[PDB]
Structure 1
Amino acid sequence: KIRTLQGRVVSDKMEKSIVVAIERFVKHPIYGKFIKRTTKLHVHDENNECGIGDVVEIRECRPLSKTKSWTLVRVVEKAV
Structure 2
Amino acid sequence: ASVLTGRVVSDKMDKSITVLIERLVRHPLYGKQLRRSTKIKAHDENNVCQQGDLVRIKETRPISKTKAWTLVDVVEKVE
Q: TM-score range by the shorter chain?
A: over 0.9
AA aligned opposite 2:4: L
Aligned to 1:34: 33
For 1:46 and 1:3, locate their aligned partners in 2 and report how far apart those are by CA, in whole Å.
19
**CA separation in 2, counterparts of 1:8 and 1:45?**
14
| TM-score for the superposition, normalised by structure 1 | 0.91
- List alignment gaps of at least 5 residues for structure 1: none
C-alpha distance in structure 2 between counterparts of 1:57 and 1:79, whole Å: 15
Aligned to 1:10: 9
RMSD: 1.0
Structure 1 or 2: larger strand share? 2
Structure 2, unaligned runs of 5 or more? none
Percent of residue pairs identical: 63
- Using the size of structure 2 for normalisation, the TM-score is 0.93
Q: Secondary structure at the match of 2:36?
A: coil
